[PDB]
Design an enzyme around this catalytic site. Structure first.
Site, short mmCIF file in Angstrom:
data_model
loop_
_atom_site.label_atom_id
_atom_site.label_comp_id
_atom_site.label_asym_id
_atom_site.label_seq_id
_atom_site.Cartn_x
_atom_site.Cartn_y
_atom_site.Cartn_z
N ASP A 8 31.17 19.98 -30.27
CA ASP A 8 31.38 18.74 -31.00
C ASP A 8 32.83 18.30 -30.95
O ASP A 8 33.65 18.92 -30.25
CB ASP A 8 30.87 18.80 -32.46
CG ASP A 8 31.62 19.79 -33.29
OD1 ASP A 8 32.52 20.47 -32.75
OD2 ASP A 8 31.30 19.87 -34.50
N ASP A 39 27.69 27.80 -28.86
CA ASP A 39 28.73 28.18 -29.81
C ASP A 39 27.99 29.08 -30.77
O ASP A 39 26.78 28.87 -31.00
CB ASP A 39 29.25 26.96 -30.57
CG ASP A 39 30.11 26.05 -29.72
OD1 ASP A 39 31.20 26.51 -29.30
OD2 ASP A 39 29.72 24.88 -29.48
N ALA A 86 0.80 -1.22 0.00
CA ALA A 86 0.00 0.00 0.00
C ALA A 86 0.84 1.27 0.00
O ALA A 86 0.40 2.31 -0.49
CB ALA A 86 -0.94 0.00 1.20
N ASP A 115 35.23 18.54 -27.21
CA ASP A 115 34.12 19.01 -26.37
C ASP A 115 33.45 17.92 -25.58
O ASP A 115 32.61 18.21 -24.73
CB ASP A 115 33.06 19.73 -27.20
CG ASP A 115 33.58 20.99 -27.87
OD1 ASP A 115 34.46 21.67 -27.31
OD2 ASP A 115 33.08 21.29 -28.98
N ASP A 129 -5.48 3.30 -11.23
CA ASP A 129 -4.93 4.64 -11.04
C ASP A 129 -3.85 5.02 -12.04
O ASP A 129 -3.46 6.19 -12.14
CB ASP A 129 -4.36 4.76 -9.64
CG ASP A 129 -5.44 4.85 -8.61
OD1 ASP A 129 -6.59 4.47 -8.93
OD2 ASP A 129 -5.13 5.29 -7.48
#
Ligand SMILES: C/C=C(/C)C(=O)O[C@H]1C(C)=C2[C@H]([C@@H]1OC(=O)CCCCCCC)[C@@](C)(OC(C)=O)C[C@H](OC(=O)CCC)[C@@]1(O)[C@H]2OC(=O)[C@@]1(C)O
Ligand code: NA
Ligand code: NA
Lengths: 994, 994
Positions: free
Chosen positions: B703, B351, B305, B707, B800
């Site tokens: 890129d 950038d 529960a 990076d 539910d």
């Protein structure tokens, strides 16, 4: 109104002011209820779960530990370190044992049942009464019944209260009063008063007893008593008032606790009086907190070292094991602590029928009158073979077989045995043997007619189930059994009125056939039968009959005799009242002696031997029988209770004779008597009491609620497997086979367990003594703790437990049953054995302390500090006695403790071997004499290595694997213990015999 | 030897003791291998299938359930009945969910790939070396290469290790270092040493980097480093050391687990402290086994529960759905848990080129010198239209169109732009538009010459693909391009040596055309061109040139300027060495200034708006660009990062300026800066770090492997769709369109999902609270279980779940992006909302317990027992409180549970509606505001009826269809919940605003 049986039916109605046709009024019901209370036995006084738990902490030793656990808990708390991974281990372990203790305690009360509560199984939930507030019968709760109201009962009903029968609505009323006795043999009730105000229940033929069942009929009566005032309720009060003493071991064990507690405190004051020198130390310096911690730390060790923590479990395991062992010999021990007390059995009171005897009745002799002529007289004595109920057998005269038919007297003799009988035979397909149906004594007569076959009926054509009642059935055709006048201890006989078969509207021909005890039946005979003729009973011929009866009953045959007669001219049928059992003797008057039959209830085939074993063991045997005094003595001489020709004048008594003796003489008689015949309802209890007044551990047999009191009182109440549920629950032991010899075999088994128990007990307490010496030494010297609580506890629970337990399987001495019963007072340890364990104690103390104090000084891989004044200090506040260097906690090194522990373990495995025998050297009593023990030691050693290597463990116990050199040192200090005791034993053997 | 670029070719050979002509010897190979290891990145540490499974059971809640499953299993086993058809259902269902849990867990690790492993795609399988044990080249596995051995590489080879080029066998060497950056623009290598020991990779023109490709040429070099010591290997270690934190939701969610667990245990002790009264019960009575089963039964219910079993799936469904939704707006989210963190984006580092701008270069201005006379000076400024690469456009002066041909300076100007260029144009038949070929900046110059057409060539006769490079091709005929001196950040310019076309055996005529950044190119000009004439560069005229450049670059035009010059008398061709790029500046000396061209890289048409949205949302925007500081600020003012006239002195920094600041000032600068220009390789990472030191959720773009670290570190690393595979795998998000505005749009989408998630999350946990109250109540009262595990589980999984999920589609607030970024610490439930769900909790608990306890007492078709002391008992051992009758199992009736279940379902469908808005009443926020929700409820209700009627189901769930009267009772107890919350909301609205 408990005198109801003696009051008339009118007087009981008058006494309570109630009308038989309307019953009590609601006002009487309320008043009677408030005056007499509800009809039920008091409810057992409640014991809450919490109240129970609290009791589980009443013991002196569980309190000492509980306290020690608190100090331990506080210490583990108010400390300075970070190794908390094993800080609360000590306190938790201790506490846990107490929990385990309480759990068991509680678990026992949940699954234990007392005999008093078993009684309530005999009180029904409902009852049926007639109360003025209604015409028809209203059934109400039995608990709401009260003295005075009219009640109704019918076949199948369990009697709700002690009721005085007002009137029997059915043709007859049959009640099964089995719960009181065991003989489901239903008894007939009447309504006529029983004159003797002191009649025992068996003769209250006009009473119904609460807890009994209606076998047949329907009756209306008035309630005489209810609640604790009924016969069963009085039995409940007798039991409720019985104070049950603790066994001899429990008493020795409890005294050991008190003393153990008194000694512990004394050693604490001892540890104090030895440090009184601290009052001479400087006001400034040292840690008053570290000193306190020291003193408190050793109390915990003292407490844990003095208590044999695992003793209660070893004892329990031995007992359970022995119990399953006793059940194999048909002895069901209910109370574990009973196995001990059983070994001490001093006197054994046994019922005869079914326990000393088989209860398989058989007729082996019978005689008729051959001829009477003046002063001359000849009888016609016979013999019968076949000790089973099976019709298989034959009759013989002068040992040669004859045909019972050729003798008329034997035909009538056989007619009587068949007609005057309420039992029969039945061949059981399963067992494949003839089973009896009814009374053993009566079936015997049935079996007799079949062997006699006075009519030469063709029974060799019928099967087993067909020839069972063949010869009887034949006899059942010559006479129509009109009605029967039941047996009553009053006249000790019974008869049946019979009318010819092939007859109609005749005013003559009726016959009455009587059966019963010889004295009275013969006294009422005015004639004697000789073939088909008859002649006046002559004084001399009567002595002939009586002399032979005396011979068969008092001679080696030990036969129960029955006289057989027929009233040739029975009274007119209209002139008889079948309701007043009191007129039955009168109806059985002017009889004709036909003959006598003597039957035997053979002694168990093992009783002769077992009785003898008891004499060899100094255990007295008392027989309780319903036989008359004479045959009773004859049976005792026969099974060996009495010698064939010894005097027994004051060694055998009947109930009557016993009552005539004053309270002082009755006591005296019980110390010498070995035969009680025709005993009263309140005798088994008095006898156990008088026996206990001479400090004898008494064993008593019995069944039904009547014997519950006595069973509860004796030290070893014994029940039959075929006995009632209540007798069982009131007993320490149950006999699956009902055999007296089982008792004996169990007493022996009981002697064997104790001897071994006495050994593992002395083994364990012995080690606790040594443990306290090591803790005391280490404190009186101020040395670092050689051993700690957690270590000792493993040893007293695991290490020493396996050997302790294995010792419970020590082979039994061969002279086991050749010596008298052990005295209850017999202490376990005292004298030379006391001094012996004292020596061993000081040895272990010295050995385990030095073993650790060694590693510190003379060890190679250790802080060699030869006499470094370990005593002088352990403060390091100075650090002066050790100039260069920065290490003081090396004192807290595990090595020295592991050396101490290892030593204790080894010495104890050695002392286990010193326990196979109290006095026999390991030279004559080899270590391998108990293979289980050797094996237990191997397992204990392997377990020791366990905690020494499996990482979580060594750190939990503060241990460290020893070098092959360190171990070698352990053996140098341990092994010698065997020599020390060997010498001590040598001294007890050659300089203490006398 | 990682300093190789700075060492001469001789020093590297000396350092390793190897000969260029023979290579390493087998002894060096073994020693070098053992010293440096194999040339490869460590293999990912293995995680066995079994090790994984085990982890799938590490969670606190999966353990609680796992345990509960065990109790459930044991209970379903040690029972007394025959309805086994549904005995093991409960345990199996529970277990199954855990399995489903583990399956998913495992499935994710199988199909997940980490950036670190993607790096290994850049290491080739083989390499070529020269080792003494052979004359010819032997190719071996790249993994067996080591520092020191001579390696060979040729066009198409993937560089195997970081190699110091020893000599270039081919005419030139071109390498594609795209994996580091992304600009496939191949770069020229040399062998001459690079003096600065701290040169960034871009300037190691004599180095080859492992993972790069040879575009052209063939070279021989010596291995400087291998393994984790190469540039790419260092990137792997930076990433491997990056600790990745869990999202804010994951952290709130994990805390909810701990607490949920801590509370469960606490309620068990609560259920115990309330039954302490059992210690006062009789020692005899009741079932200690049934009590235990009771307590254990509710633990299972407690556990089931308190856990919102279906929450993990609803969250997962919402996320997947939202993800497909974000991909529609060009935002590719890789990490599901990233959608949340994205909504919290606090700072966005972007950038400029291609993300803020289009990267579609175009020249729009250019000027030459009009005339110089003493202190007087005039320039000839122009303009050019056409923002595409298409030759379509025209030149103009004073805004009026002219002919570039009428100005000589413009002819040479155009000659330079054509000859000093390595790019061209190409008309794509498909797209039907002019595509660029090479550098964007260079193509722009190409497009320029075509619009100028300084020679009035007839290009209106040629097609699209024919006039693309028309005017250029014409210029390519006047001069023969001998060779070209590449560009180097060192001198920031490039030139081409050219000799006249129609010539032969002349010793004069050669020309050098230079192009580059204005400062340096102009500083090396000693003359200025005016038409066809030339005059000494005068200090003043130089300022004129410089002032206009400053204007174009720092003014609103934000143009990138290039200076164009020609060395009229280039040095003798023999006097030049084309191998030492270091002598290139010198060769480009004594120049003639011809003119300047200013080109534009236009901001994306949406960036102005999106930048503004970010300010409205409290999200900071930081631009990272290669532009010089000045133009960078000008671009920021232009797109709105900075206000046209605000001060930015300490809000914009170049790499250099940043490094000159101490670790304390750098941190400070990052909280205020919005413009980083000319940033170092290690700055994006430092910036993300400093930003995170202010608890800001940072988003970073980029890129190449360079990076990757920063992308991994920032909370939302962002990659371009046109970026490298490694950058992508290192990012949370990919931009299919490379557009900065996508980031913004996704942050918003992210804010919308969370708001809705916060709602279905609060909806479900809310119901678990109410579920535990009902289980607690029913235990504190001792009432029969109102609800069981199997029932709750269907509700938390199916019933539910549908509404929970539908709530994920709640319309978004209109002020979504008009409020600051949510705080990560922002708890989901607390304050008035805490108390609110507390009330609702107690409501559900009461409502579901009473609903069942009702049927028992006040129901018509039920065992009406008004206050029948359901509490007092459920033992039936007495059966006294109910005299007449024979039925106790009516307690196990399904009706009362079905009443409880039905109530829960209805209240929850009601609470779903109470969840469309935290504070808006269903009066202002209509239930139909979310059509999906209404529809989900209809489906949940229909499903409820499903289990209530389709026979296998009702018996599995222990249910029974309700009467139209029983349902009616459910609505009386459920519906009111809407009013309770309505009132609670009313209180939060009118008495909690401030
Ligand atoms: C799930 C079911 C139950 C029953 C539970 O105890 O949840 C608690 C709990 C663990 C929290 C509480 C629940 O606390 C109670 O209900 C208080 C104790 C009384 C219950 C006794 C029943 C007889 C949440 C549910 O609810 C209310 C109504 O107060 C709110 C919130 O939860 C959240 O914000 C969800 C996080 C994603 C948390 O206080 C949370 O703890 C945290 O750390 C948070 C910050 O998380
Ligand atoms: Na007893
Ligand atoms: Na990241």
């Amino acid at each position: 109104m408990e005198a109801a049986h003696s009051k008339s039916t009118e007087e009981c109605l008058a006494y309570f002011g109630v009308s038989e046709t309307t019953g009590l009024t609601p006002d009487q019901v309320k008043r009677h209820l408030e005056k007499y209370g509800h009809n039920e036995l008091p409810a057992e006084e409640g014991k809450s779960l919490w109240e129970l738990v609290i009791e589980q902490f009443e013991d002196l030793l569980v309190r000492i530990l509980l306290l020690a656990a608190c100090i331990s808990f506080v210490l583990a708390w108010f400390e300075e370190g970070e190794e908390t991974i094993t800080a609360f281990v000590e306190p938790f372990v201790i506490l846990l044992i107490l929990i385990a203790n309480a759990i068991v305690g509680v678990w026992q009360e949940r699954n234990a049942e007392n005999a008093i509560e078993a009684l309530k199984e005999y009180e029904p939930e409902m009852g049926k009464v007639y109360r003025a507030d209604r015409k028809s019968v209203q059934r109400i709760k039995a608990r709401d019944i009260v003295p005075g109201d009219i009640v109704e009962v019918a076949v199948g009903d369990k009697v709700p209260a002690d009721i005085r029968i007002l009137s029997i609505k059915s043709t007859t009323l049959r009640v099964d009063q089995s719960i009181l006795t065991g003989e489901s043999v239903s008894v007939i009730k009447h309504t006529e008063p029983v004159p003797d105000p002191r009649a025992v229940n068996q003769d209250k033929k006009n009473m119904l007893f609460s807890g009994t069942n209606i076998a047949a009929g329907k009756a209306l009566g008035i309630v005489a008593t209810t609640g604790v005032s009924t016969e069963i309720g009085k039995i409940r009060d007798q039991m409720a008032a019985t104070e049950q003493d603790k066994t001899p071991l429990q008493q020795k064990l409890d005294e050991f606790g008190e003393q153990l507690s008194k000694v512990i405190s004394l050693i604490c004051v001892a540890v104090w009086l030895i440090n009184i020198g601290h009052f001479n130390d400087p006001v400034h310096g040292g840690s008053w907190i570290r000193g306190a911690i020291y003193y408190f730390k050793i109390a915990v060790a003292l407490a844990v070292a003095a208590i044999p923590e695992g003793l209660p479990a070893v004892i329990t395991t031995c007992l359970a094991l022995g119990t399953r062992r006793m059940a194999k010999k048909n002895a069901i021990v209910r109370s574990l602590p009973s196995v001990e007390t059983l070994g001490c059995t001093s006197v054994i009171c046994s019922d005869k029928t079914g326990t000393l005897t088989t209860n398989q009745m058989s007729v082996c002799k019978m005689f008729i009158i051959d001829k009477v002529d003046g002063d001359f007289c000849s009888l016609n004595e016979f013999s019968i073979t076949g000790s089973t109920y099976a019709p298989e057998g034959e009759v013989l005269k002068n040992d040669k077989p004859i045909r019972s038919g050729q003798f008329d007297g034997l035909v009538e003799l056989a007619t009587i045995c068949a007609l005057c009988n309420d039992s029969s035979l039945d061949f059981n397909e399963t067992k494949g043997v003839y089973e009896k149906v009814g009374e053993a004594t009566e079936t015997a007569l049935t079996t007799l007619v079949e062997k006699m076959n006075v009519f030469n009926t063709e029974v060799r054509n019928l099967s087993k189930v067909e020839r069972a009642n063949a010869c009887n059935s034949v006899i059942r055709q010559l006479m129509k059994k009109e009605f029967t006048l039941e047996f009553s201890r009053d006249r000790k006989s019974m008869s049946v009125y019979c009318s010819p078969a092939k007859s109609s509207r005749a005013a003559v021909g009726n016959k009455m056939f009587v059966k019963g005890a010889p004295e009275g039946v013969i006294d009422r005979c005015n004639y004697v039968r000789v073939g088909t003729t008859r002649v006046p009973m002559t004084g001399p011929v009567k002595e002939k009959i009586l002399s032979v009866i005396k011979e068969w009953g008092t001679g080696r045959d030990t036969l129960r005799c029955l006289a057989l007669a027929t009233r040739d001219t029975p009274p007119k049928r209209e002139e008889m009242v079948l309701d007043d059992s009191s007129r039955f003797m009168e109806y059985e008057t002017d009889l004709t002696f036909v003959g006598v039959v003597g039957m035997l209830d053979p002694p168990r085939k093992e009783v002769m031997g077992s009785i003898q074993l008891c004499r060899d063991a100094g255990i007295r045997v008392i027989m309780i029988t319903g036989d008359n005094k004479g045959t009773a003595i004859a049976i005792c001489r026969r099974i060996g209770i009495f010698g064939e020709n010894e005097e027994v004048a004051d060694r055998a008594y009947t109930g009557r004779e016993f009552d005539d003796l004053p309270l002082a003489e009755q006591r005296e008689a019980c110390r010498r008597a070995c035969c009680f015949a025709r005993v009263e309802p309140s005798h088994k209890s008095k006898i156990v009491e008088y026996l206990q007044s001479y400090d004898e551990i008494t064993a008593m047999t019995g069944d039904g609620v009547n014997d519950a009191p006595a069973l509860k009182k004796a030290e070893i109440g014994i029940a039959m497997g075929s006995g009632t549920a209540v007798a069982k629950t009131a007993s320490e032991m149950v006999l699956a086979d009902d055999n007296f010899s089982t008792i004996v075999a169990a007493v022996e088994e009981g002697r064997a367990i104790y001897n071994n128990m006495k050994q593992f007990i002395r083994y364990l307490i012995s080690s606790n003594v040594g443990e306290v010496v090591c803790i005391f030494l280490t404190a009186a010297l101020g040395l670092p703790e050689a051993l700690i609580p957690v270590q000792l506890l493993w040893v007293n629970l695991v290490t020493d437990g396996l050997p302790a337990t294995a010792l419970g399987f020590n082979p039994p001495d061969l002279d086991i049953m050749d010596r008298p019963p052990r005295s209850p007072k017999e202490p376990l340890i005292s004298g030379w054995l006391f001094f012996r364990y004292m020596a061993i104690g000081g040895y272990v103390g010295a050995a385990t302390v030095g073993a650790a104090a060694w590693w510190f000084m003379y060890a190679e891989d250790g802080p060699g500090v030869t006499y470094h004044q370990l005593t002088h200090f352990m403060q390091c506040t100075e650090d002066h006695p050790h100039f260069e260097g920065l290490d003081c906690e090396i004192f807290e090194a595990p090595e020295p403790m592991t050396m101490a522990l290892s030593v204790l373990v080894t010495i104890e495995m050695c002392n286990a071997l010193n326990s196979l025998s109290e006095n026999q050297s390991l030279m004559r009593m080899p270590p391998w004499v108990n293979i289980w023990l050797l094996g237990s030691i191997c397992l204990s050693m392997s377990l020791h290595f366990l905690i020494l290597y499996v990482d979580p463990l060594p750190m939990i116990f503060k241990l460290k694997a020893l070098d092959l050199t360190q171990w070698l040192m352990v053996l140098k200090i341990s092994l010698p213990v065997i020599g020390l005791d060997e010498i001590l034993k040598f001294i007890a053997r050659n300089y203490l015999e006398g």
